[PDB]
Design a protein around this ligand. Structure first.
Ligand SMILES: [Mg+2]
Ligand SMILES: [Mg+2]
Ligand SMILES: [Mg+2]
Ligand SMILES: [Mg+2]
Ligand SMILES: [Mg+2]
Ligand SMILES: [Mg+2]
Ligand SMILES: [Mg+2]
Ligand SMILES: [Mg+2]
Ligand SMILES: [Mg+2]
Ligand SMILES: [Mg+2]
Ligand SMILES: [Mg+2]
Ligand SMILES: [Mg+2]
Ligand SMILES: [Mg+2]
Ligand SMILES: [Mg+2]
Ligand SMILES: [Mg+2]
Lengths: 92, 155, 106, 61, 197, 127
RNA sequence: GAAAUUGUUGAAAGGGAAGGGCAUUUGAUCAGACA
RNA sequence: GGAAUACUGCCAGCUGGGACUGAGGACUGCGACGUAAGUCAAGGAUGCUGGCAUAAUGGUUAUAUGCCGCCCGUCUUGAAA
RNA sequence: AAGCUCGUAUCAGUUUUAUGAG
RNA sequence: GCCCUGAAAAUGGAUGGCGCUCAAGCGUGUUACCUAUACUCUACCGUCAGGGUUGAUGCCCUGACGAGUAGGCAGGCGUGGAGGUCAGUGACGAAGCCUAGACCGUAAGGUCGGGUCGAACGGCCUCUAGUGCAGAUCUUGGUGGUAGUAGCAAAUA
RNA sequence: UUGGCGGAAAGGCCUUGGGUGCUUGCUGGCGAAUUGCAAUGUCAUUUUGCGUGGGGAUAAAUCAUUUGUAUACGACUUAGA
């Protein structure tokens, strides 16, 4: 506590406020959908390849401010490699 | 080559285990756990309830009954380390519990359970009614009060 | 009735320590109503739970548990030593724990 | 702590092995190792020891 | 065994009371101390006044407002004694100190609450008879505390009200004890006596 | 589907970081022994970092084993893979980092046919 | 197209330094094993 | 006069509660209980049961808490000085 | 660190006995 | 025996702090208790020693040990280039670089995933050296804090 | 709902009357099971959120301009529908 007010709790009140604030912010982020889903969720990528480029390519094929962009060089390479995979799937 | 093949490999034959000198001898229960004793359940769904101990089973579990007419606890298994044995005992010579065992309780309402419950509960009620306040005692639940000391409490 | 408690209240005092190093693997526990080591011998081997709350739900509950057990008495005044599966977080020095009555010898 | 009366981790030595990389010499050393282990004959012990010696210690006869 | 323990500071010795309260706070108990002006320090009044003037000597030379802060009130004297026994620069120590409240007199709501004593800190149980002792209110007044008369008048008013309350409670106690006596001859009372009640 | 083994014990799971690598960017984390005559880390004063030594050596019966119980063998092609045809319970194949996706498909098919576990089967083969 | 150094965004911590060790809570995030 | 008890010691006397550990991996040995076939606590843990089957245990990472930790190198007994 | 030996061999920051000194 | 006096300067400060008076002081006696990298037992690592054994500088059994500067011996990790080999890797992406991801080594280090990128490069047996950096008021280049700061006020406008 | 008292930080203490529930003071009749032998096995006030609504109230401060009782700059102190 403070020397100017010894009967008033200070650190405990600050800690209580901080805990409540962090819990509220975590709930808000979860509701906004910025957290990963459960491991067994259908849209979970656990155990699979994680790629910004492939996510962007498939989102654009499916049809705010972000720093995730996909270059045309990588997009053309993804198109070429997908045609390779499709030819293999047809031949098998 | 990404890696040179090692010269020596471990054998793929699984070894056998050695012969074990650990025989299963029967459990020796606590001296205070006698058939007919009233027990306090310390854990589970029926925690804090007072039941009647009937039989020691082959899986080291105790068969108990409420009886179901008194406090609604059916014929169940409990672990002996999760009950507290009291000083109160009812007469158990009129109860036939030869049918109940591990196979009886295996889960892989049946109404065989219900009829057996009634058959045991009849003789249990007949003996319970002899001691005054015993039915009310079995219907009431156990809990710790303020200042109770389990290391000094007598049961 | 008005009370449903089946445990004894306890306080997490501190870790096992000398004057200038602590051992987080062992907690010191003060059980309510226990004033001598001979009294505390009743509680050796009993299960202990530290029961706490969190905002994020996990498997259908906001209540979380750290489990442990009483191992031996400590000192002359009735304090015991305890070991938990995961060590207690040291923010709980002075927090409450529950000592259950199982496994039972009565 | 222990008050050691002798030196710790001290090698006996006695020239356990030959320093040559000659395959034929290593074969002879293997044969006389078997003989000196399985016969309890002092001759085989002496031959096995003499197979480990250096050139300046193996003068001609 | 209470969520909050109210300790009447009258007749207690400052250091032994501060030791027990510091330990109780660190073990996690909420404590309210009342009547800090009736606390006692062993030793004669001039000795304790000399010690406080030594404390008053201590101050930062280049800036007196940075220095040790000399609080004159009896509750603050006890608080200094207690904070010396708590490791108050750590978060654990601060959290312990925030489980304590210290008051002069008995302000609301504690005046209608139960107040306990600490036998290991009581002067009549600890000091050998004939040894001199000081009282915190007089010490504080001599070193600059200015509210001894206000607290004394408020304490007198509280005592009048509490005395009227105790008179009513005593009359009701007599009635209940009387009516409980006449049921002691029934079979229920005999059975209760056989069981120990 | 590995050979049975004792439960794997690691005496020191933390990385041994070089002293003052947290303090200076020019000092990398790769372990170096302090050679200074007055070094508190060299002299083993209380409260300093732990130094690598042979007492931390792992059990010889669980050494080099993955959590599933296999040893990792690097493979570059099907011929390298087939060296593990009889050591299925003790070795798992890891495809080298510079193998193309087209050859990784062939290696994975051969491994499935032979029953050989592959440590990194998702590499370069996103569907 | 590295590092020092810098901007924006997101997350966090902060009552006269920060950094490090042991241990655990919380939040974020993640692999294996799944007959 | 005749007992008892304390104190100290001994028992290849009996027995209740708690904690940590379970290395080894066909057999081989020394023994014990039995008239015997066999059995055993005798050259290192087995049996029975439940829940979960995934972020649940665990790892990593950002931090919080308790305790510990002075800035390295060089040079001089020695160095925060 | 290397050789030749020996290995009831070589001994010993110790005591004992005998015999000096104090 | 205990107590008081038996001399003291000069910023505010110290039985470590709080404080303590039938002590939490002093002398002594009896027990209980706390905890070191010490002692006992077990596991694991390495070293040494003693044994056994027709991938044998391997395997197995047994016992005991582990401080360390100058210094010594030994086994290993990494780099440029050379001979041999894997009919090795590679435009379905070599090398390099970034990485809240994964694993193996006591460690030197090694390995895998993602992103970026665009043309070469590795494992093993050996050969060879201009072969490993935190320092040298080290060399060359680049960049911070200081800081939107000091200041941009002689010569009349 | 009737009345009284409490200012030390009163925020509480006592009291009138009727209404509406329970009462284990005593005697009865139904129910409980499968959470499977434990797993805190979740139980207590306040709610800057929203939908329903019946009622209540319709401000200032700062910049800019301005004074000099003020002033390095901020700040201060004045004035203006
Ligand atoms: Mg040692
Ligand atoms: Mg460019
Ligand atoms: Mg950078
Ligand atoms: Mg965890
Ligand atoms: Mg320190
Ligand atoms: Mg002391
Ligand atoms: Mg004494
Ligand atoms: Mg590449
Ligand atoms: Mg050079
Ligand atoms: Mg450099
Ligand atoms: Mg250097
Ligand atoms: Mg320089
Ligand atoms: Mg320069
Ligand atoms: Mg300027
Ligand atoms: Mg001019």
């Amino acid at each position: 506590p403070s020397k100017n007010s010894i009967n008033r709790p200070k650190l405990t009140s600050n800690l209580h406020h901080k805990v409540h604030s962090l819990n509220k912010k975590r709930a808000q982020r979860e509701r906004a959908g910025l957290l990963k889903p459960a491991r067994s969720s259908v849209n979970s990528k656990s155990g699979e390849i994680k790629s910004v480029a492939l996510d962007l390519y498939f989102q654009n094929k499916k049809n705010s401010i972000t720093t995730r962009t996909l270059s045309k060089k990588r997009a053309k390479k993804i198109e070429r490699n997908l045609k390779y995979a499709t030819q293999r799937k047809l031949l098998v | 080559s990404a890696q040179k093949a090692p010269k020596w490999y471990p054998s793929e034959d699984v070894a056998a285990l050695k012969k074990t000198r650990k025989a299963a001898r029967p459990q020796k229960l606590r001296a205070s756990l006698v058939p007919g004793t009233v027990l306090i359940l310390l854990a589970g769904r029926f925690r804090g309830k007072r039941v009647v101990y009937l039989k020691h089973l082959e899986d080291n579990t105790l068969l108990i009954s409420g009886p179901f007419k008194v406090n609604g606890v059916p014929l169940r298994r409990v672990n002996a380390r999760y009950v507290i044995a009291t000083s109160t005992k009812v007469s158990v010579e009129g109860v036939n519990v030869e049918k109940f065992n591990v196979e009886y309780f295996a889960k892989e309402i049946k109404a065989e359970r219900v009829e057996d419950q009634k058959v045991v509960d009849k003789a249990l009620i007949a003996e319970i009614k002899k001691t005054p306040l015993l039915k009310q005692y079995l219907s009431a639940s156990f809990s710790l009060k303020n200042g109770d000391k389990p290391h000094m409490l007598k049961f | 009735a008005e009370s449903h408690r089946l445990y004894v209240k306890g306080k997490h005092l501190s870790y096992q320590r000398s004057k200038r190093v602590n051992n987080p693997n062992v907690s010191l526990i003060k059980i309510e109503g226990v004033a001598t080591p001979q009294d505390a011998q009743f509680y050796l081997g009993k299960r202990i739970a530290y029961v706490y709350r969190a905002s994020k739900e996990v498997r259908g509950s906001k209540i979380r548990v750290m489990w442990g057990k009483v191992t031996r008495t400590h000192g002359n005044s009735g304090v015991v030593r305890a070991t938990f599966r995961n060590n207690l977080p040291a923010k709980t020095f002075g927090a409450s724990v529950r000592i259950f009555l199982y496994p039972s010898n009565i | 702590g222990i008050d050691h009366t002798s030196k710790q981790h001290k090698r006996s030595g006695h020239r356990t092995a030959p320093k040559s990389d000659n395959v034929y010499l290593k074969l002879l050393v293997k044969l006389y190792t078997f003989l000196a282990r399985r016969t309890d004959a002092p001759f085989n012990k002496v031959v096995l020891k003499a197979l480990f010696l250096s050139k300046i210690n193996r003068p001609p006869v | 065994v209470e969520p909050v323990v109210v300790i009447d500071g009258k007749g207690h010795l400052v250091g032994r009371l501060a030791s027990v309260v510091a330990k109780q706070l660190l073990n996690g108990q909420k404590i309210v101390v009342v009547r800090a002006e009736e606390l006692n320090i062993s030793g004669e009044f001039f000795r304790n006044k000399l010690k406080y003037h030594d404390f008053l000597r201590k101050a930062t030379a280049f800036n007196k407002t940075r220095g040790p802060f000399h609080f004159r009130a009896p509750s603050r004297i006890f608080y200094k004694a207690l904070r010396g026994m708590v490791s108050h620069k750590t978060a654990r120590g601060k959290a312990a100190l925030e489980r304590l409240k210290v008051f002069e007199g008995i302000p609301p709501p504690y005046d209608k609450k139960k107040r306990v004593v600490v036998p290991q800190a009581l002067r009549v149980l600890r000091l050998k008879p004939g040894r001199k002792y000081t009282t915190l209110g007089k010490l504080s007044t001599s070193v600059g505390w200015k509210y001894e008369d206000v607290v004394a008048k408020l304490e007198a008013k509280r005592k009048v009200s509490s005395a009227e309350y105790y008179a009513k409670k005593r009359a009701f106690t007599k009635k209940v004890a009387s009516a409980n006596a006449t049921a002691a001859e029934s079979d229920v009372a005999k059975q209760l006596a056989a069981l120990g009640y | 589907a590995s050979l049975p083994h004792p439960k794997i014990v690691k005496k020191h799971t933390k990385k041994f970081k070089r002293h003052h690598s947290d303090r200076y960017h020019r000092v990398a984390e790769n372990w170096r022994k302090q050679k200074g005559i007055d070094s508190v880390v060299r002299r083993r004063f209380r409260g300093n970092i732990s130094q690598p030594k042979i007492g931390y050596g792992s059990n010889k019966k669980t050494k080099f084993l993955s959590p599933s119980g296999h040893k990792t063998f690097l493979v570059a092609n099907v011929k390298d893979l087939e060296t593990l045809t009889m050591h299925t319970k003790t070795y798992a194949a890891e495809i080298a980092h510079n193998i193309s996706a087209k050859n990784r498909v062939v290696i994975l098919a051969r491994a499935k046919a032979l029953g050989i576990k592959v440590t990194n089967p998702k590499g370069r083969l996103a569907l």
